[PDB]
Design a protein around this ligand. Sequence first.
Ligand SMILES: NC(=O)c1ccc[n+]([C@@H]2O[C@H](COP(=O)([O-])OP(=O)(O)OC[C@H]3O[C@@H](n4cnc5c(N)ncnc54)[C@H](O)[C@@H]3O)[C@@H](O)[C@H]2O)c1
Ligand SMILES: NC(=O)c1ccc[n+]([C@@H]2O[C@H](COP(=O)([O-])OP(=O)(O)OC[C@H]3O[C@@H](n4cnc5c(N)ncnc54)[C@H](O)[C@@H]3O)[C@@H](O)[C@H]2O)c1
Ligand SMILES: NC(=O)c1ccc[n+]([C@@H]2O[C@H](COP(=O)([O-])OP(=O)(O)OC[C@H]3O[C@@H](n4cnc5c(N)ncnc54)[C@H](O)[C@@H]3O)[C@@H](O)[C@H]2O)c1
Ligand SMILES: NC(=O)c1ccc[n+]([C@@H]2O[C@H](COP(=O)([O-])OP(=O)(O)OC[C@H]3O[C@@H](n4cnc5c(N)ncnc54)[C@H](O)[C@@H]3O)[C@@H](O)[C@H]2O)c1
Ligand SMILES: O=c1ccn([C@@H]2O[C@H](COP(=O)(O)OP(=O)(O)O)[C@@H](O)[C@H]2O)c(=O)[nH]1
Ligand SMILES: O=c1ccn([C@@H]2O[C@H](COP(=O)(O)OP(=O)(O)O)[C@@H](O)[C@H]2O)c(=O)[nH]1
Ligand SMILES: O=c1ccn([C@@H]2O[C@H](COP(=O)(O)OP(=O)(O)O)[C@@H](O)[C@H]2O)c(=O)[nH]1
Ligand SMILES: O=c1ccn([C@@H]2O[C@H](COP(=O)(O)OP(=O)(O)O)[C@@H](O)[C@H]2O)c(=O)[nH]1
Ligand code: NA
Lengths: 321, 316, 318, 306
Amino acid sequence: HMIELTGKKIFITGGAGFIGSTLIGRLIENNEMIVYDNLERNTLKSQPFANHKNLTLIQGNVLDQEKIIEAAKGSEIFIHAAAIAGIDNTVKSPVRTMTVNMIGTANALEAAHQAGTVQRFLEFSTSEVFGSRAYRVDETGAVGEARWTYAVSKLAGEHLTHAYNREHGLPTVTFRPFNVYGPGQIGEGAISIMIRKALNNEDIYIFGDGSQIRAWCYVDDMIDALMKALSVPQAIGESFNIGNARAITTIYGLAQTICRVLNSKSEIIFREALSADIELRIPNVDKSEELLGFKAQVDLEEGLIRTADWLSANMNDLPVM
Amino acid sequence: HMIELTGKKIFITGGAGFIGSTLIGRLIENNEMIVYDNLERNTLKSQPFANHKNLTLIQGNVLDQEKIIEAAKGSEIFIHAAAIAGIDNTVKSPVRTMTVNMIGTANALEAAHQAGTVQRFLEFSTSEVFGSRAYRVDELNTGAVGEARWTYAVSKLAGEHLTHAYNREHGLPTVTFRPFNVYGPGQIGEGAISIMIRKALNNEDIYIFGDGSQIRAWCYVDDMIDALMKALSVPQAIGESFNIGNARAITTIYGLAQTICRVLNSKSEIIFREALSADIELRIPNVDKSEELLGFKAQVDLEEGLIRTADWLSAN
Amino acid sequence: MIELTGKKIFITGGAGFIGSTLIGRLIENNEMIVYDNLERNTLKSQPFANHKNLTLIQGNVLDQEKIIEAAKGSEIFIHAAAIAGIDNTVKSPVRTMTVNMIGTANALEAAHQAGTVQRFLEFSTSEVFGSRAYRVDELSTTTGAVGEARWTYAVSKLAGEHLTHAYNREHGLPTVTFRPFNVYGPGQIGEGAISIMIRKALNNEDIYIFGDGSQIRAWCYVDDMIDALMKALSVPQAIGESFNIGNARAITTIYGLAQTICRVLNSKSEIIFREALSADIELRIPNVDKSEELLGFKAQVDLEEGLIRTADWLSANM
Amino acid sequence: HMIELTGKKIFITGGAGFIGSTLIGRLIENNEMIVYDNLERNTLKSQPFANHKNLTLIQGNVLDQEKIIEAAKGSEIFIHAAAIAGIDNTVKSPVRTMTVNMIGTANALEAAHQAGTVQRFLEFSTSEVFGTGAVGEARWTYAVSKLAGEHLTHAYNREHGLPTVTFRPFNVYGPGQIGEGAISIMIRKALNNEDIYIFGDGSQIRAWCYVDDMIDALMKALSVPQAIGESFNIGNARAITTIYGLAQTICRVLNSKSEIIFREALSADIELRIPNVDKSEELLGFKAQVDLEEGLIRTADWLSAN
Ligand SMILES: NC(=O)c1ccc[n+]([C@@H]2O[C@H](COP(=O)([O-])OP(=O)(O)OC[C@H]3O[C@@H](n4cnc5c(N)ncnc54)[C@H](O)[C@@H]3O)[C@@H](O)[C@H]2O)c1
Ligand SMILES: NC(=O)c1ccc[n+]([C@@H]2O[C@H](COP(=O)([O-])OP(=O)(O)OC[C@H]3O[C@@H](n4cnc5c(N)ncnc54)[C@H](O)[C@@H]3O)[C@@H](O)[C@H]2O)c1
Ligand SMILES: NC(=O)c1ccc[n+]([C@@H]2O[C@H](COP(=O)([O-])OP(=O)(O)OC[C@H]3O[C@@H](n4cnc5c(N)ncnc54)[C@H](O)[C@@H]3O)[C@@H](O)[C@H]2O)c1
Ligand SMILES: NC(=O)c1ccc[n+]([C@@H]2O[C@H](COP(=O)([O-])OP(=O)(O)OC[C@H]3O[C@@H](n4cnc5c(N)ncnc54)[C@H](O)[C@@H]3O)[C@@H](O)[C@H]2O)c1
Ligand SMILES: O=c1ccn([C@@H]2O[C@H](COP(=O)(O)OP(=O)(O)O)[C@@H](O)[C@H]2O)c(=O)[nH]1
Ligand SMILES: O=c1ccn([C@@H]2O[C@H](COP(=O)(O)OP(=O)(O)O)[C@@H](O)[C@H]2O)c(=O)[nH]1
Ligand SMILES: O=c1ccn([C@@H]2O[C@H](COP(=O)(O)OP(=O)(O)O)[C@@H](O)[C@H]2O)c(=O)[nH]1
Ligand SMILES: O=c1ccn([C@@H]2O[C@H](COP(=O)(O)OP(=O)(O)O)[C@@H](O)[C@H]2O)c(=O)[nH]1
Ligand code: NA
């Protein structure tokens, strides 16, 4: 049945983070929202709505199976967003990435299952699941091994999610965002770095031959998809790739786009890459269109400008090298 | 890092089962051995060394992280054999298969890591990991049996992934060991070879379910044990994954039935019947690395191994 | 749609094994022209070799002018001329590629210019699908002589399929692509594994298994293949389609095949492993469900029965 | 075994088109050159060396087996460039595409073989080889017709010892041709601040090779003995980009005010993987020197002047 996103108890693991903070902003006026988060990151505390009457912060680890079961009782929409995704974090501690992502998802599924009240379980996976298949434990550089580690940790969570769907009829939705950019993101990914350089006409360096592919999704597009995924009955039992087919580019092509759209004079320079990466193919987004009725509306030019606007407005809150 | 397999403290999760019991038989005279098993199966009890002074049985679940950490203290060789591999059980409860295999393996690795004394950690995976890449979680529609086999395969592959992480991050001296299906004396068994030998010996009909073209790879018990001894000892095993079996003992089900009936001089008829459930197609992996690095090459082919198995089955 | 009586039939490679066999079934009711260079000649040994309805033209499919001329007025055009040479002592990839690729082009063009063709049936091979997993620039002692010759054969047939498709799409030539699994049965001695192992088994001679014996081969009994052929040549929904023609129950390993042969024929032959003479490649066996659904074909002769029929023919003919 | 590209008898099928004209321009001063072309295209007749004393034009079809065999007699370098290529030509007929490319290569190979004198046979293939309207049909047809030519080339090398090189250029661009490709149209539009249309989601990859790099690669392949029996991907690893990315690059590099606008494609995307170019560096000592920025500017300069 269609779910109306008002008057619901919404439980969000990882809810202190970027995506979770964003979704809270959008739903908190009309719903009780409980964040379950170990505050490894805390985007949420810096929002207007951090102290809303409808908002609860439970500090907890998804690896604590007992605590997540209790905290999730009565919840009607369960959103599982807690994870470790950082490449450098994964180089250093692959065990923590694997464990948090695989066992955390098991634990979240079990909590949702035991609650008995969950009308939608939404599991955040990742697009790199697709590319990951053409590599092997048996068989790249530190970056590549860490990206593989991340991807397979998320794939294992999808497998668990499927088993709960099949065995228990848990109403699951697997949600795989392309890399999200936009206002709100502080971060040190290519878009935020390159916009910041371009705005000041600083040199932009391309590590490698610049032909590596990255797909993006603008923040507001990802959120619109998420509301559909959380609501429409056709999402249940289904997996979705969430992004913009028009926002798939090479890193060199991204640098040219950003400099062009911002009227930047930045010079773009080729450097040697610091580590070999693995090449992953970008998945198709048609099923999101077909079943969620979702088609991304914010193309790169618009998205990059809106992002550059927010970065300039908020230029006192980061620094990098 | 050549390990001599005497005078060691050996800890074996799932040690009450078929492979654990069999390996204990070979090591118990010269080693302190600890079994950690919840006794879903218990082959060990039927053995004559069940009550050896060198043997301790700890009844516990690999999901009980505290208990397994404690039980594994001081262990010098850690063998993780506990798992759920049953197709019918995995049909009924895929969550239990995934949980026991993935989380049980996580807990086993953590217990080995925490012990600090482990010289070799050997994790039992499964050959179907290789086939499983052909399929997609969001594509499954496979039949019940095929979805169950896939579920089992991916649960094992997650285990391998965890194992890799511990090796890379903490230097845990790991070996991933993927046995082809094991047959021979000591498995009374329930899979095709055991069933088909028993039928053939009494000239009963052997029914082939579906088109008979499904591939199964096999390994004779003594070959698998030999490989395991190499994997537990030899320094080249550390950080590697091995497919353990016999490249001459890969056959179709129809082919297997023909082979069993010829070799045993059976008068059984072999008769086609409808399949009960669709299954997944799995490619069999290469066993070459096992020769190169462990010095292991299986010596018992099907003709010899089927006869040895039938002799045992008749005598019992 | 097409009733296989009163038709003008033109068959390249008609002197060969499958061509000969098909001629037995149609020659009573159809005018048939065989276009063949007689590199092989099964036809000359058959009772109908000199039938009033049969005309032989000794010609090469690489002689573009002759085949166009010879094919004039044909209503059913069957392109069966091909070579393989996978296991041959003297490897000739050029011969295989030119005969199969260009021979197919010249046949298609002969069919197209006659204007009269209602059905064009091209023989391909099941190996075309697996072939895509290998790359021409990455062929090694990985591949071996037999591997490379099997790849040569497969890609020469795949090119023929592409040609056939182009003629279908551009010119509306009514084409059918027919991919027989390896055919065995009465009518020829043969040099394949079934023939060789049956002859050994009948004399209790040792059977040797090259490599590890786990190589898979799929087999189709001759009568089943001819039944599929008759349906492909007639039924309307065959046009513009490709078919994998086999028996799902006769897909086995070479060792399992040996064991089956010895058991079925009550032989005392030993079966012994030996190192392979040459490295081979691995090619997937495609699914046959569409053939059943669209042609209404399902193979009815399983290996036990087929091996007995074959062995009886071999014993009576030697 | 290193071949010196002077004083040779060079036979080029398809020598009247773009790449053939270009190569003739570099070699005609110092070699006897025979062009074997049916003149479906004829860039050559526009060139100052069209009537050079060292150039003989034979107007012929690579489908005429006996003629090409005769014409190629005594040839020391055999360059097989004859093909139905460019969507303008290939869209016309899948049959003609498949036939000229596959059979034409077979015939070229047989001509080189029968000559007995060929020290290098260079076969042009296409980078699409290892990737449903008339247009998608003609591209697929082109790709497999070229892959079939690679197969025949292999067979000849293996069986007869023919000293073959399979040469697979990325899409060639640069001065000396208005052109028909994306770079051509997009630069023209950009130079006029004319809006550029992107059909589909614009994610389609295209890799490029600057004409002068392609020619430098071709010279190495024709001479260096390590080229024999090999297949090469010839292009610039830094000049792989999406169609949308290319449009952004052209507009920025040329300071254009063109808008880049998405439009509908009823066609389905072809996700071609782009091959690796390392072997060319290792074996030919070839690495592309003209990157996109520089190439686009030289292209724009030529287009402007003309
Ligand atoms: N943002 C993207 O571009 C993107 C792309 C692909 C996938 N995703 C996935 O979407 C989800 C949300 O992403 P995000 O960008 O908001 O990331 P984020 O890091 O901002 O949010 C994740 C949150 O999880 C919390 N957390 C980490 N470990 C935890 C643990 N053990 N127990 C409890 N909480 C824990 C962190 O404190 C953080 O607030 C994640 O699963 C991520 O992998 C995001
Ligand atoms: N026998 C084979 O042919 C084969 C093939 C492939 C893989 N393997 C793997 O090798 C290992 C050993 O195989 P086996 O044939 O001896 O299996 P088995 O079933 O005989 O032994 C496994 C043992 O694990 C125990 N166990 C199950 N769940 C447990 C849990 N939660 N906690 C503790 N103990 C638990 C069972 O009681 C049983 O004794 C397993 O990992 C299996 O998947 C075996
Ligand atoms: N028999 C099989 O198991 C099998 C399997 C797969 C595909 N096929 C294909 O089916 C078709 C027929 O097979 P078959 O078993 O009858 O083979 P076959 O060799 O018995 O018959 C082919 C005929 O083509 C003739 N021929 C060869 N080259 C010629 C040329 N250049 N010009 C004219 N005639 C020429 C031969 O003389 C022969 O009579 C062939 O295309 C073959 O590739 C057969
Ligand atoms: N230009 C590129 O970017 C590019 C890219 C990949 C591959 N290639 C290949 O490189 C080679 C040259 O490319 P190009 O751009 O110079 O092409 P082109 O079309 O300019 O040249 C092909 C030439 O072959 C001739 N020709 C066509 N059909 C013929 C026939 N039947 N007999 C004889 N001659 C015939 C044409 O008249 C023309 O001069 C071709 O083989 C082409 O497939 C080119
Ligand atoms: O200024 C920059 C930032 C990033 N990159 C490259 O662009 C890709 C995307 O980097 P990002 O930081 O977005 O993270 P990733 O997607 O690799 O995790 C990687 O190959 C980076 O090396 C680059 O060349 N220049
Ligand atoms: O008498 C028998 C026993 C098994 N099988 C088939 O042989 C395969 C192997 O079955 P087994 O019991 O060994 O277990 P599985 O490997 O399928 O888990 C399956 O397709 C069974 O259906 C069969 O056709 N006849
Ligand atoms: O006595 C024999 C005959 C054949 N083969 C193997 O069986 C397979 C099929 O052989 P066949 O002669 O039918 O030809 P192919 O299909 O290899 O072209 C090949 O791997 C052969 O090496 C074998 O092991 N023993
Ligand atoms: O300004 C342009 C030029 C090309 N294309 C796309 O790229 C395809 C091929 O363009 P190109 O001119 O490179 O064609 P080719 O050289 O392959 O014949 C077209 O069908 C369009 O989908 C486009 O969208 N905009
Ligand atoms: Na001949």
